[PDB]
Design a protein around this ligand. Structure first.
Ligand SMILES: [Zn+2]
Lengths: 213, 192, 82, 135, 175
RNA sequence: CGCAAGACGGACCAGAGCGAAAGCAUUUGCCAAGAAUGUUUUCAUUAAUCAAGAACGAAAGUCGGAGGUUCGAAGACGAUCAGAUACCGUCGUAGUUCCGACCAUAAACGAUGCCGACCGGCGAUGCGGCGGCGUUAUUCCCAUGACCCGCCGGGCAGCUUCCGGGAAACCAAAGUCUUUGGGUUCCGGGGGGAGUAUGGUUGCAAAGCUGAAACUUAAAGGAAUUGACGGAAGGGCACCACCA
């Protein structure tokens, strides 16, 4: 009986200021049906946006996640929520005759955003290596896992999100660990494979306004 | 560097596409042309120098040497100008300069109709082992005279004694030749 | 094959073998003679040393115990006792 | 009615192609995914449960939603292609691979092909026995 | 201009360099598409152009360069460009029955046969073409030709000898 | 998009490693063990194999508790066939999970006791050590890792071979055996009856360990070789086949 898309509306998603592109798509929202507010039904959605759909000089085997927190007259003013890699890239990296090394740390930001960072780094066959295998002994792996736990402990702790996200976008963190682990066992593809989001502060409007402009 | 589908045709003198022909010309200082109507200035190709007896041949097809007869030919890239400035990138990298997978014991020399000696020289008399012509041929699936009859692929040869002796293509399985003999093969393989 | 004088082996081979498996057992370690540069005192340390040989008047480590041979410290040379 | 957008600028959506062994789903959503735009099940078209997981039933579902997609201004799609995963098979079937090629020619601008299959790291007991099951 | 990209493993790299006229020519000519192999990401990546005629000239080009990555022969992969409905179904060899150790490696011996004779047979009688990776079984054919390619494949790798499989194909191949 | 409960630790995962054997794969910390390598440290025959006896012992099973996601013997349903209570699917108890006791069997396998000696090669790999031109850790100062070449020792494995064996298949041990003796433990005597009966013993039970005879029978069995026939499939030929 009822054609429901006459009862809809159309909002715009707009990225925060770390990225070149801001308006990156649409999002359907049913209007206020008296009781439930149309802004209320929008207030928590996540957006699995890639990298080259946000910053143009960049390779898009990475992703980001973004919360429509505020509804300000047909704009989704959008926060940072999380980060992970493309599963095709993940399945591409895990070869056989090398070693997978991981670590995970729970770090706070300076502004109350509790993060859980992950790390993935692989051993690297040398450019004169003849042995098919490139494995690190288990104590070498516990060394490398500690610096992986060390480097991304300080950098979220020292900073806030607007500086942390900017470290994520060229993966400034993972390029540090690559140089910092050459002396133990040379690594190959060291990334922050995934970043979770554990807790948030009380919500601040003007923090988000300054996070856009 | 894309392809941008025009560039396949963009990939007094002479018109030779053989580098053994093109090498001798520019060392005299003889500017020639090609199917490209412009003259030649750059000659980029590959030759094979014997790592054993230091003997370069312009042939890229052979894998055994012409002077010493070993498998010590290695890939050598050249760059020849119109004047004939021979400057050759000898790849100084010990992944190629390597004695690793080079010593292994060989089976007894076997003589018979179906013996397979492990291809040492370029001309020792192998027995005539050939594929059956109903197996050796692939599909010319381009050709539109194609609809009538059999399955959408080539029929596999399960009948002949070319298949029972497991005769394979000499080009097929070449990546297993590059594997060193003394390695960790899986416990249920058997090659040729 | 089949023709080897075991009375007279070649010494490089005899150096190459495991120390118990020679014709007659001759071990591989020796005595180095540690000359610490800071002091003047000649100290004699075993080549495959275990736990730390200190300097007497200087309280200075001359060697650290690794697996097979001991590692010296910086600048401390040695002279092999013939 | 809908996205009042200039013509060089696409209005992306997200299409969920769920494969099974009994049917295939085609499911066009928001970029968030919380609203879907239209869900046409692969066993809505063919009235034969034998043919419910057909490539042909996949074509008929995907043509009837790119009709509905183009109806509502969605000119482009990011495709989250999906198996059943978990304990059972991990790779999406040809009935998912069919509907992909179906709404490619139907005028939808196809962007990123995404493999969202539920994969376990380490799962519970397989539904089959120790002896095996036909698959 | 829209594009597709698709990865490569390291054992499938050297087949591309051996076949970079034969994968090269039909994509660029018969479909009007542009093809690269990004070595900094090691992916094969094609895009459309102005000379791209068909709307789905790209989609059936991706599956051709997918099937070559999945180990299929070059010529036998070419018909994905041409024929309207060829497909592929991929397997985990342990998705049917939990083999392991050498009981896993004897599933490969049954499903290959001596000299490939069992693989060569099921391709002939079920109008398909299959490729065995280690834990992975990839089949390529029509849908009903696929649906009775899995069952000859599934029933080799839960115990039955090839002769009971050879008999039980042709009772279904009659229809 | 959240919340919860329990199991699981894929890919990495290798003819790699460890453990007496069953067996063992998320990080971190703690608790004690262990081989191998290194030794110009110590004791100076302290040993090898082992009836009695003892610890551990896959899965399933039995009692208590706790926990009950997945899967699931039994059981209850619903379905194609001349026949089916079977090959199917839906649920699903016990169990699969943790803790405390029992229980002691497996195609527990290398279907191959343990210790020692001798007897052909060849590289690869795991761990430790030794030596060395080189390249990278931003070079460099020595470090120390990461690779690279070689050597030693003990490992898991290969590959090779007219060593010698073997009924042969095959084995570098299954060799050094009529030219028969290094030391030592368990254990077989044509095939069934039968691992049954009875007795003893352990256990709550299930069962485990030990274990016959009367009687019956001319074979049973092992390797290797040729066919036959296919309700097995394809290639070649034929107007006693087909197409036109
Ligand atoms: Zn030569």
């Amino acid at each position: 009986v009822v054609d429901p898309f006459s009862k809809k509306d159309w909002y715009d998603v707009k990225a925060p200021a770390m990225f070149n592109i801001r308006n990156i798509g649409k999002t359907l929202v049913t209007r206020t049906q008296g009781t439930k507010i149309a802004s209320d039904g929008l207030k928590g959605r996540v957006f699995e946006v890639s990298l080259a759909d946000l910053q143009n000089d960049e390779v898009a085997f990475r992703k980001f996640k973004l919360i429509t927190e505020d509804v300000q007259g047909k704009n989704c003013l959008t926060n940072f929520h999380g980060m992970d890699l493309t599963r095709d890239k993940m399945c591409s990296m895990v070869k056989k005759w090398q070693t997978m090394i991981e670590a995970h740390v729970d770090v706070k930001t300076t502004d109350g955003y509790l993060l859980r960072l992950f790390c993935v780094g692989f051993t690297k066959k040398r450019n004169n290596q003849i042995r098919k295998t490139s494995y690190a002994q288990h104590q070498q792996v516990r060394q490398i896992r500690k610096k992986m736990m060390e480097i991304m402990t300080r950098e979220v702790q020292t900073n806030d999100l607007k500086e942390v996200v900017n470290k994520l976008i060229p993966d400034s963190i993972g390029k540090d660990i690559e140089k910092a682990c050459q002396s133990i066992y040379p690594l190959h593809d060291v990334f922050v494979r995934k970043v979770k989001m554990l807790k948030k502060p009380k919500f601040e409007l003007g923090k988000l306004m300054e996070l856009h402009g | 560097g894309w392809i941008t589908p025009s560039n396949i045709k963009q990939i007094v003198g002479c018109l030779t596409t053989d580098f053994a022909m093109q090498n001798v010309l520019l060392q005299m200082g003889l500017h020639v042309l090609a199917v490209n109507g412009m003259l030649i200035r750059e000659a980029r190709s590959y030759i094979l120098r014997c790592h054993g007896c230091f003997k370069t041949t312009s042939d890229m097809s052979r894998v055994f040497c012409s002077h010493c007869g070993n498998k010590t030919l290695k890939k050598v890239s050249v760059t020849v100008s119109d004047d004939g400035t021979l400057h050759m990138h000898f790849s100084r990298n010990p992944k190629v300069l390597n004695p690793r997978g080079l010593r292994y014991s060989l089976p007894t020399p076997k003589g018979g109709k179906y013996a397979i000696n492990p291809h040492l020289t370029e001309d020792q008399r192998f027995p005539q082992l050939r594929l059956s012509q109903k197996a050796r041929q692939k599909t010319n699936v381009f050709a539109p005279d194609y609809i009538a009859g059999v399955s959408p692929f080539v029929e596999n040869d399960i009948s002949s004694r070319s298949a029972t002796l497991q005769v394979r293509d000499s080009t097929l399985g070449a990546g297993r030749r590059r594997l060193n003999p003394n390695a960790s093969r899986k416990k249920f393989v058997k090659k040729r | 094959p089949l023709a080897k004088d075991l009375l007279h082996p070649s010494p490089e081979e005899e150096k190459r073998k495991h120390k118990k498996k020679r014709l007659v057992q001759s071990p591989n370690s020796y005595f180095m003679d540690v000359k610490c540069p800071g002091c003047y005192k000649i100290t004699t340390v075993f080549s495959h040393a275990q736990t730390v040989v200190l300097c007497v008047g200087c309280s200075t480590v001359l060697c650290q115990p690794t697996g097979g041979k001991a590692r010296l410290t910086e600048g401390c040379s040695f002279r092999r006792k013939q | 009615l809908g996205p009042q957008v200039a013509e060089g600028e696409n209005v992306f959506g997200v299409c969920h192609i769920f494969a099974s062994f009994n049917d295939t789903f085609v499911h066009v959503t928001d970029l968030s995914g919380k609203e879907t735009i239209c869900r046409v099940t692969g066993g809505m078209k063919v009235k034969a449960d034998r043919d419910e997981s057909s490539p042909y039933a996949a074509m008929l579902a995907a043509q009837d939603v790119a009709q509905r997609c183009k109806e509502l201004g969605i000119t482009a799609l990011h495709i989250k292609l999906r198996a059943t995963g978990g304990n059972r098979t991990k790779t999406p079937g040809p009935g998912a691979q069919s509907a992909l090629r179906a709404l490619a020619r139907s005028g939808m601008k196809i962007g990123r092909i995404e493999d969202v299959t539920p994969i376990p790291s380490d799962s519970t007991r397989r539904k089959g026995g120790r002896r095996g099951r036909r698959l | 201009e829209e594009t597709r990209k698709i990865p490569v493993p390291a054992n499938r790299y050297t087949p591309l360099k051996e076949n970079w006229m034969k994968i090269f020519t039909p994509i660029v000519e018969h479909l009007g598409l542009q093809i690269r192999f990004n070595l900094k990401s090691r992916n094969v990546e094609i895009r459309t152009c102005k000379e791209t005629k068909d709307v789905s000239a790209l989609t059936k080009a991706a599956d051709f360069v997918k099937a070559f990555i999945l180990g299929f022969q070059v010529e036998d992969a070419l018909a994905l460009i041409r024929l309207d409905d060829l497909f592929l179904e991929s397997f985990e060899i342990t998705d049917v029955k939990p083999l392991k150790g050498d009981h896993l490696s004897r599933a490969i011996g049954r499903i290959a046969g001596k000299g490939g004779k069992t693989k060569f047979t099921i391709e002939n009688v079920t109008r398909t073409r299959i490729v065995l990776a280690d834990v992975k079984v990839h089949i390529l054919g029509s849908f009903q030709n696929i649906k009775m390619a899995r069952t000859a494949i599934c029933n080799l790798i839960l115990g039955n000898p090839p002769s009971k499989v050879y008999g039980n194909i042709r009772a279904v191949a009659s229809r």
